[PDB]
Amino acid sequence: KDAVLVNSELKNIYMKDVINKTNMKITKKIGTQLIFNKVISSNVSPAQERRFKEEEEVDIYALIKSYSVICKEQYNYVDGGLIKTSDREKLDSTIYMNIFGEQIPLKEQSKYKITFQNKFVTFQEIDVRLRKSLMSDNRIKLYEHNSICKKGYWGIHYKDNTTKFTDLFTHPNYTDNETIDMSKVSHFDVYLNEEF
């Protein structure tokens, strides 16, 4: 299973900004990195690299891992976050986030919703936005030294009753560009202080 990390590291990882752009043509392509023109480098799996060709337009939603200036031009490094611009069908979805946990009032239980406008969204996007929403929540303060959440996980609860669970104290491997079909998603479930 993915190794559990501490608040300090998790906070550092998920507090960073994200790249959220559309119609980005892959300019250069080197190794396992798909480059775009500030320069955006997306580290992806050997498998995913094959599926993407240069000059191909890609929509990007990825958390930035680091920056580096090179010859007065800034580089933004990220893992995956790619969906072909031609793979984008529109769809308005307002998915509810149900938060469960001993200190969670019914009032905060289902007040959170995450809005999507494409039928297909990367899992990285859902995971990152869900974590950031939990991080800013005044009651929860996810990854803060002082947070009431010591451990936990969440899940995408599909309409067919199946679920996809993720440990909130781990850093998923986003290099595979896993994508979620939003039309098959019913809601999101957050399980605070519950063993994964």
Residues making up the annotated binding site for Zn(2+) are 157, 187, 189
The answer to the question of residue 189 lying near Zn ion (CB under 5 A) is: yes
Helix (H) or strand (E) holding 7: helix 7-14
Other beta carbons within 10 angstroms of residue 148's beta carbon come to 15
Distance of CA 19 to the CA centre of its chain: 11
Q: Which window, 21-29, 41-49, 82-90, 185-193, contacts Zn ion (CB under 5 A)?
A: 185-193
Q: How far is the CB of 109 from Zn ion (least distance, A)?
A: 12
Q: With 0-12 CB in 10 A as exposed, 13-18 as middle and 19+ as buried, what is 193?
A: middle
CB closer to Zn ion out of 129 and 157: 157
C-alpha closest to that of 10 among 104, 111, 127, 109: 127
DSSP for 137-177? Answer: -TTT-TT-TT-S-SSEEEEEEETTS-EEEEETTS---GGG-
Question: Which residue has its beta carbon closest to Zn ion?
Answer: 157
Binding to Zn ion (CB under 5 A) within 112-171 occurs at 157
Q: How far is the CB of 157 from Zn ion (least distance, A)?
A: 4
Q: How far is the CB of 36 from Zn ion (least distance, A)?
A: 37
CB closer to Zn ion out of 51 and 159: 159
CB closer to Zn ion out of 86 and 163: 163
Q: How far is the CB of 133 from Zn ion (least distance, A)?
A: 17
Counting Cα atoms < 13 Å in the Cβ hemisphere of 148 gives 12
CB closer to Zn ion out of 137 and 189: 189
The footprint of Zn ion (CB under 5 A) covers 157, 189
